[PDB]
Paper text:
Laccases (EC 1.10.3.2; benzenediol:oxygen oxidoreductases) belong to the class of multicopper oxidases catalyzing the oxidation of phenols accompanied by the reduction of molecular oxygen to water. Laccases are composed of two or three structurally similar cupredoxin-like domains. The active site of laccases comprises four Cu atoms classified into three types depending on their spectroscopic characteristics. Type 2 and type 3 copper ions form a T2/T3 cluster responsible for the reduction of molecular oxygen to water.
The aim of the study presented here is to determine the structure of [name] [name] containing the complete set of copper ions. For this purpose, crystals of the type 2 copper-depleted form of [name] [name] were soaked in solutions containing Cu+ or Cu2+ ions. Restoration of the native form of the enzyme was only observed in the experiment employing Cu+ ions. The structure of T2D+Cu+ was solved at 2.3 Å resolution. Superimposition of the T2D+Cu+ and T2D structures using the coordinates of 525 equivalent Cα atoms gave an r.m.s.d. of 0.16 Å. Residues 1–14 (the numbering given is according to the T2D structure) and residues 405–408 were not located in the electron-density map for T2D+Cu+. It should be noted that in the structure of T2D Cu2 is completely absent and the sum of occupancies of the copper ions in T2D (2.6) is almost equal to the content of copper ions per molecule for the enzyme in solution as determined by mass spectrometry. In the T2D+Cu+ structure the type 2 copper ion has a square-planar coordination formed by the His87 N∊ and His429 N∊ atoms and the O atom of a water molecule. In the T2D structure His429 is coordinated to Cu3α by the Nδ atom. Thus, the removal of type 2 copper ions could be associated with changes in the orientation of the side chain of His429.
Residue numbers in the entry: 15 to 404, 409 to 543
The structure:
Amino acid sequence: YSIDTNWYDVTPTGVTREYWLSVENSTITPDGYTRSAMTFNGTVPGPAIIADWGDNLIIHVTNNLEHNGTSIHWHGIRQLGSLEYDGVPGVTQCPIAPGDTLTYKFQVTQYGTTWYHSHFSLQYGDGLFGPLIINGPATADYDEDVGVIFLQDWAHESVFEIWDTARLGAPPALENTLMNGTNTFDCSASTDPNCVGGGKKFELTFVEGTKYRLRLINVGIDSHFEFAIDNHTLTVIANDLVPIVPYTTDTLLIGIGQRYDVIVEANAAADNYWIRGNWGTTCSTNNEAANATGILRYDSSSIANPTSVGTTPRGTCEDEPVASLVPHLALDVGGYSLVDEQVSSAFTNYFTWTINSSSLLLDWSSPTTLKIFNNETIFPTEYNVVALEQEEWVVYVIEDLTGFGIWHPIHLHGHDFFIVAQETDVFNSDESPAKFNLVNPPRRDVAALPGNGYLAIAFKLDNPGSWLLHCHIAWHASEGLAMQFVESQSSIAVKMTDTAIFEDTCANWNAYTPTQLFAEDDSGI
Ligand SMILES: *[C@@H]1O[C@H](CO)[C@@H](O[C@@H]2O[C@H](CO)[C@@H](O[C@@H]3O[C@H](CO[C@@H]4O[C@H](CO[C@@H]5O[C@H](CO)[C@@H](O)[C@H](O)[C@@H]5O[C@@H]5O[C@H](CO)[C@@H](O)[C@H](O)[C@@H]5O)[C@@H](O)[C@H](O)[C@@H]4O)[C@@H](O)[C@H](O)[C@@H]3O)[C@H](O)[C@H]2NC(C)=O)[C@H](O)[C@H]1NC(C)=O
Ligand SMILES: *[C@@H]1O[C@H](CO)[C@@H](O[C@@H]2O[C@H](CO)[C@@H](O[C@@H]3O[C@H](CO)[C@@H](O)[C@H](O)[C@@H]3O)[C@H](O)[C@H]2NC(C)=O)[C@H](O)[C@H]1NC(C)=O
Ligand SMILES: *[C@@H]1O[C@H](CO)[C@@H](O)[C@H](O)[C@H]1NC(C)=O
Ligand SMILES: *[C@@H]1O[C@H](CO)[C@@H](O)[C@H](O)[C@H]1NC(C)=O
Ligand SMILES: *[C@@H]1O[C@H](CO)[C@@H](O)[C@H](O)[C@H]1NC(C)=O
Ligand SMILES: *[C@@H]1O[C@H](CO)[C@@H](O)[C@H](O)[C@H]1NC(C)=O
Ligand SMILES: *[C@@H]1O[C@H](CO)[C@@H](O)[C@H](O)[C@H]1NC(C)=O
Ligand SMILES: *[C@H]1O[C@H](CO)[C@@H](O)[C@H](O)[C@@H]1O
Ligand SMILES: [Cu+2]
Ligand SMILES: [Cu+2]
Ligand SMILES: [Cu+2]
Ligand SMILES: [Cu+2]
Ligand SMILES: [Cu+2]
């Protein structure tokens, strides 16, 4: 097994790996400002889940929150034959009730960098995410793996406090950003007792001449980054969970939920350097956007702020150029049927996004998968179901008709897709399909729907189940910018063990909902 192994077809034998995670109500001080958080195991980021390609994960998730369901998603994890462990509440399970435990089981049939996060409403915005790193092949050599660097915005209160405001349609400017869970913040004016100060920059220490694999993930609520390290080059070796033909870049545009693995050679004059998130100010607002930075040190004892000169950011909300993103294991898209769908917006009780006029709104007590187990094939209109059955491919064209010009990071569950087109133009059903790239196009699981343009993503019908596709901007998802593919419904294979477990989760959730303190007040996802 190697970098040229087809991991969609072949999977190594591995070992069983077991984790207990507690979804917790916490207090943290990541940037010198003390606030509530919703965490795995009291840390933001959550604990590292590290495994090998082909391992079986067993992850016992206990919900120790008092006032929310929860449901944990393993982002970009294919979940072939483990649909009920995808962690989408209202799609592949009922929410895990307070006090209850759901044990997620799945094999990792991919390798690279990803993460896990709650998919229950906005929870991941309060810190409910962690790294999921799967060891395997890599398209370039390096001597050291520094692991993951999370890039995010960071509020100074619960995302749930500001939801009622945000749902009037404008995402609010958050108070700060974190790089790998930390940042500075100026508390030396504040009369807020929580602003205790002492927040510190993310530090990364290089040994000169050593090669470092960095694993970048944008995990913000509503944030775009263009990661750069002053006077260093990034050699990009993977996008999401798909190794790519290495290419070098001064900066790396990164949408929410996207990952890149980069190799950085520490071949610069030994000094302190700015590490730049390069918050996309055009993409979304932040109170402290220029402070989305950290410190590269070649000398650990140095406590000096770097004074390096950075590269000029492209300053866009785009993804990396399609031409740059060439998977190592080349794969082409076969004959396809085309599904076309259109993003617009409406206002009801609040601001919603629509997919062909319907905003996603799930009933947590009746997930698509329960409906499937009950042999339903017609789904509520607000479940935004697109049915798929075998031409073994689908091109899904999603069009921004909102007029907003936001670059939406579109995430597909159950599949890597193929970026056959990512265009800043109006989609024409008679002209545009011709301009698709079907021959080893970029392949990944988050890609930008360009603002005012279209994203055309192809996938194979190789994974029966009900698969959410959504904007990964947390507000947008909560605002129903989502649909779901019900793929070969009659081919979905579920174990009696897993059906029993699913039913129990739903039973406990149904036992919880009559005295819940808080109702569902978003899409559910
Ligand atoms: C950004 O910030 C994050 C922190 O949020 C930071 O994360 C760090 O990532 C590093 C690189 O990826 C990482 O370094 C690695 O750590 C690995 C593992 O850490 C260990 O855990 C080991 C294994 O767990 C155990 O299994 C053994 C048997 O082998 C048992 O003895 C042990 O009891 C435990 O038990 C079992 O767990 C299994 C599943 O794991 C189950 O199957 C079993 O049933 C049982 O429950 C252990 O061997 C180690 O001692 C250690 O605890 C290393 O393997 C790897 O080689 C590498 O060194 C680091 O740990 C992360 N740190 C934190 C705090 O999360 C990033 O580095 C930050 N990024 C940057 C750029 O700074
Ligand atoms: C999940 O749990 C959290 C508790 O952490 C619940 O958050 C709460 O959500 C409600 C309803 O949105 C909030 O009420 C609103 O507060 C704002 C801001 O002060 C106000 O403008 C509104 O008029 C409204 O009253 C409440 O503040 C918020 N609480 C906290 C501590 O954040 C959330 O509703 C739970 N969701 C589910 C589905 O269980
Ligand atoms: C997380 O917390 C739970 C509950 O305390 C504990 O059982 C579990 O072992 C912890 N897991 C890790 C990875 O720290
Ligand atoms: C977390 O704790 C806060 C403060 O005690 C509480 O008001 C809130 O309801 C809790 N959140 C959840 C999801 O249980
Ligand atoms: C980052 O924040 C600190 C604290 O306010 C400030 O001194 C510094 O100027 C900031 N950098 C900017 C605004 O570019
Ligand atoms: C969505 O709407 C457009 C325009 O009416 C139409 O071409 C397309 O087929 C619709 N898609 C679905 C899946 O209903
Ligand atoms: C769903 O269909 C299968 C196969 O016909 C059947 O065995 C099962 O009992 C059905 N569930 C229902 C009708 O609720
Ligand atoms: C990735 O590669 C493409 C194609 O060579 C470039 O256009 C891009 O700027 C980046 O280097
Ligand atoms: Cu309470
Ligand atoms: Cu995700
Ligand atoms: Cu996902
Ligand atoms: Cu969006
Ligand atoms: Cu998702």
